[PDB]
Amino acid sequence: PPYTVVYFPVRGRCAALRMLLADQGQSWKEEVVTVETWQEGSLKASSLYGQLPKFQDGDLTLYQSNTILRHLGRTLGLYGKDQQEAALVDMVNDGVEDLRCKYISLIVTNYEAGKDDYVKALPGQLKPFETLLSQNQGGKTFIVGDQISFADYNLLDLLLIHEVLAPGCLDAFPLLSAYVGRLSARPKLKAFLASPEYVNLPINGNGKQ
Amino acid sequence: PPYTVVYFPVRGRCAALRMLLADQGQSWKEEVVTVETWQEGSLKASSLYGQLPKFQDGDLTLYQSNTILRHLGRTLGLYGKDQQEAALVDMVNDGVEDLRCKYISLIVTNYEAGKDDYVKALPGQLKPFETLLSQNQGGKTFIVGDQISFADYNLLDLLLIHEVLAPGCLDAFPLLSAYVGRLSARPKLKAFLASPEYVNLPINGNGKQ
Ligand SMILES: [Ca+2]
Ligand SMILES: [Ca+2]
Ligand SMILES: [Ca+2]
Ligand SMILES: [Ca+2]
Ligand SMILES: [Ca+2]
Ligand SMILES: [Ca+2]
């Protein structure tokens, strides 16, 4: 620390890492980049790969939402108990990222024509996470092992935005349904999810959800 | 160990992790899944996310190429010297993954219409890795720090396939050019890159490169 999130005025790819920081009792600063400021060019030109989020942690500057999640995961001890669990955490997070990419593609490039096919395919895309929960303490704790990991926050975000896209999509998945309610009720995370800094941002920048 | 790679008869998303295993003096089995066998449906249905590679390490079964890379990275000490370098390794690997997804999209979905624009955009996409090298001991060692990491193998693969797509694309990037030569000359990696198990596979499954 100190932590600074540099991003567009949306939840998007920073939602999960913000939930992680709030739930872990961390403070951070939000530095907002508007679409007009981004269009100007200076920050884009100065970013490593031409994209946001940028994240500052003391004198470390990071780019890439999943890099930030893994960093916070490693530094705050949210990375499983041993190397095998760490692999499982990664496997879950990579699967979340895969579906998030498909979600973003729908939202940004193909919402109207693609939503129907996307929602039809959704149960099959969500089932693996239910299966993973079923194989871990009957789905009663976390996605991997018995302590929260960075993957849980990313998975929780994915589930939350999918319930908005396709209300009731978790109804067929009792373990995923209970997991969302259960993680969301964690006192610091509950407060954050209720707070203006979360509630007053749109999920995505183009108005679609 | 023992290690088993389960994949299509292509280099694709297993090329980097195979280079890593070979360079680290590891043996592994290749179990080939044909397109005809894959279309039958049993392995697909049994896979966590409906995709290959599947990787077996003793009694651990993993999916997701970058999960496999990080697991091998963690277990073989190819993950930087401390937490900060580990974040930097992740940042590099996520950037490689981003460009690989763009590469795969071109190859699988849009090769003939998209190649011109892709190749015009390519120098801008490669420059960050040159910059990263420039900032690490003048580009003379590895992508992050003083020892090889899993991200090096993934970046090396990305560079090799791009030289096949766009011969001479590294000519403008002396640190990236020298880096490909230098890593490729590491004795165990050199041997592997010359071996029938590498040379006799196509880069991609659809004949394009
Ligand atoms: Ca912990
Ligand atoms: Ca319900
Ligand atoms: Ca129902
Ligand atoms: Ca090492
Ligand atoms: Ca040259
Ligand atoms: Ca030249």
Side-chain angles (χ1 to χ4, degrees):
Chain A
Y3 301 117
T4 307
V5 173
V6 181
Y7 198 47
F8 310 111
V10 304
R11 305 185 189 154
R13 288 187 164 278
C14 290
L17 65 90
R18 285 159 171 160
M19 289 197 288
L20 186 164
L21 291 165
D23 194 42
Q24 292 300 313
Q26 297 309 303
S27 281
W28 74 96
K29 167 181 207 200
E30 292 287 356
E31 293 194 351
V32 173
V33 182
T34 68
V35 163
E36 225 225 306
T37 296
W38 184 245
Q39 284 169 1
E40 181 270 331
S42 313
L43 185 68
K44 186 184 171 69
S46 82
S47 68
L48 178 54
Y49 302 114
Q51 300 193 303
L52 298 179
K54 175 180 167 177
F55 186 78
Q56 307 175 319
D57 173 4
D59 83 333
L60 180 62
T61 307
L62 297 178
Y63 295 92
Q64 298 279 1
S65 59
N66 294 125
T67 293
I68 302 156
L69 287 170
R70 281 192 172 88
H71 172 62
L72 293 172
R74 200 173 291 114
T75 58
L76 297 181
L78 318 173
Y79 219 139
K81 72 174 177 195
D82 54 28
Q83 289 179 335
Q84 279 205 6
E85 276 194 1
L88 300 181
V89 173
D90 280 338
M91 193 171 62
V92 173
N93 202 67
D94 286 356
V96 167
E97 169 64 11
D98 242 301
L99 186 51
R100 186 183 296 281
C101 288
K102 291 178 174 63
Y103 175 91
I104 295 164
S105 187
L106 172 69
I107 288 295
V108 172
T109 79
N110 200 33
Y111 190 88
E112 292 76 27
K115 188 174 196 185
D116 189 68
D117 299 320
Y118 188 95
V119 169
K120 288 197 168 79
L122 183 54
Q125 299 302 113
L126 298 174
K127 196 174 161 52
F129 306 102
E130 178 81 4
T131 302
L132 289 158
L133 286 173
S134 81
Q135 301 168 328
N136 182 39
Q137 296 295 64
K140 287 159 149 37
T141 56
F142 304 100
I143 190 74
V144 177
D146 57 24
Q147 298 189 11
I148 199 158
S149 73
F150 70 85
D152 283 295
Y153 296 105
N154 204 8
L155 177 54
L156 175 64
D157 182 64
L158 183 82
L159 295 174
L160 291 175
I161 68 184
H162 281 84
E163 272 287 345
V164 168
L165 182 71
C169 65
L170 298 183
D171 190 63
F173 305 106
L175 301 178
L176 289 172
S177 222
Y179 171 88
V180 170
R182 182 171 70 250
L183 269 56
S184 292
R186 292 170 64 89
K188 287 177 187 287
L189 187 48
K190 178 159 157 46
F192 170 73
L193 291 175
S195 76
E197 72 179 284
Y198 181 87
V199 172
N200 295 345
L201 296 189
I203 299 169
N204 309 120
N206 71 355
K208 301 178 190 185
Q209 64 177 202
Chain B
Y3 297 122
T4 307
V5 173
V6 182
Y7 198 48
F8 315 110
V10 304
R11 302 183 191 157
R13 286 180 164 283
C14 288
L17 68 89
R18 286 159 171 161
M19 289 196 299
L20 187 163
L21 290 165
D23 194 46
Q24 295 300 316
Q26 301 303 309
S27 72
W28 72 96
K29 173 181 210 199
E30 292 287 357
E31 294 193 349
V32 172
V33 182
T34 61
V35 279
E36 201 207 312
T37 302
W38 182 245
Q39 288 179 314
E40 186 270 334
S42 299
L43 220 218
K44 182 173 173 70
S46 77
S47 65
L48 179 59
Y49 303 116
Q51 285 158 280
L52 304 181
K54 177 181 164 175
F55 188 75
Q56 191 72 25
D57 173 2
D59 75 347
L60 175 63
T61 308
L62 296 175
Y63 294 90
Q64 300 273 0
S65 59
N66 293 124
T67 291
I68 301 158
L69 283 173
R70 283 189 173 89
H71 169 63
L72 295 171
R74 203 176 285 113
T75 61
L76 301 179
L78 321 174
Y79 220 136
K81 78 182 174 193
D82 53 34
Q83 289 178 159
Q84 178 153 311
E85 282 198 353
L88 296 183
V89 174
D90 284 335
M91 194 175 60
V92 173
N93 202 69
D94 291 348
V96 167
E97 175 58 12
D98 263 18
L99 185 51
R100 186 181 299 283
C101 293
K102 293 183 188 195
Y103 174 92
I104 296 164
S105 183
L106 173 69
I107 287 290
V108 174
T109 80
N110 200 37
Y111 188 87
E112 25 293 309
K115 189 175 187 188
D116 186 67
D117 297 321
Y118 188 96
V119 164
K120 281 163 74 194
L122 179 53
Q125 298 303 303
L126 297 175
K127 191 166 162 62
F129 303 105
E130 180 80 5
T131 302
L132 285 158
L133 283 175
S134 74
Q135 298 171 325
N136 184 40
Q137 307 218 294
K140 298 183 185 314
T141 59
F142 303 98
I143 193 69
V144 173
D146 289 343
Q147 299 188 13
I148 201 167
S149 71
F150 67 90
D152 283 294
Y153 297 107
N154 206 10
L155 176 60
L156 175 58
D157 183 63
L158 187 81
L159 297 171
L160 290 173
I161 67 189
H162 278 87
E163 270 290 340
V164 167
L165 185 71
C169 61
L170 305 183
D171 190 63
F173 305 106
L175 305 182
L176 288 173
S177 290
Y179 173 86
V180 171
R182 185 171 68 252
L183 270 54
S184 294
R186 295 164 64 88
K188 280 176 180 200
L189 187 47
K190 178 169 194 306
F192 170 75
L193 289 174
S195 74
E197 76 182 282
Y198 179 89
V199 164
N200 291 170
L201 298 186
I203 297 163
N204 306 303
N206 70 173
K208 302 183 191 186
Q209 62 172 24

